[PDB]
Amino acid sequence: ISRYFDRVGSHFLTGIVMGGRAILASSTNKLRVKRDYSVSVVAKASYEGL
Amino acid sequence: VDSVSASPDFVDFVPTIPMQEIWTLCSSEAQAEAMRKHYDDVWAPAQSEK
């Protein structure tokens, strides 16, 4: 019996609808990152004697 | 795609009854059991290992 239900099914279709179906799923991700740092240093000396 | 409509090839199973054991087609229960027993005990283990 178990094989019979496996091989031909426990039921048969008696009420069906005839159709087209279409599905779409779509996703997008974007990421952009920017980071920058700048350093500037100046040191000056002037010195005098006699 | 036009060629697929004229000449489709086997791509996938029907998941409910994809294939039948060959010894179902046997003449005789003694042979069929011997084939099943050998398949179960010997050949399917070897092939799954192979």
UniProtKB/TrEMBL annotation, chain B:
Highest taxon of the lineage: Bacteria
Protein name per its UniProtKB record: Uncharacterized protein
Classification of source organism: Bacteria, Pseudomonadati, Pseudomonadota, Gammaproteobacteria, Pseudomonadales
